[PDB]
């Protein structure tokens, strides 16, 4: 015939260091064009307010 009593204490220091990195995108709007341009007038008259 046996009877056993037990008791416990525990400390636990857990240090965690997380890194994370995300790349978001939209398939309709994925890039923006910026065109450098220059106008030429090879004609004989000047032209005003050119668009």
């Amino acid at each position: 015939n046996s009877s056993t009593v037990a008791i416990d204490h525990s400390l636990s220091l857990a240090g965690e260091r997380t890194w994370a990195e995300t790349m978001g995108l939209n398939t309709a709007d994925t890039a923006r064009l910026n065109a450098n341009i220059r106008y030429v007038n090879t004609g004989t008259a000047p032209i005003y307010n050119v668009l």
Partner: protein, 51 residues
């Protein structure tokens, strides 16, 4: 003032004092001079709007 009801007077038509783009067969007063503008869609680009 124009027999064909188009915006060019019979005088302007026969004498040639007219928009030059008006095709020659329509220079005649009894022939109506009007644009016929239809759009055709050469191709259609869908872009799925997805993140």
């Amino acid at each position: 003032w124009s027999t064909a009801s188009d915006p060019y007077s019979d005088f302007e038509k026969v004498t040639g004092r007219i928009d030059k783009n008006v095709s020659p067969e329509a220079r005649h007063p009894l022939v109506a001079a009007y644009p016929i503008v239809h759009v055709d869609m050469e191709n259609i680009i869908l872009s799925k709007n997805e993140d």
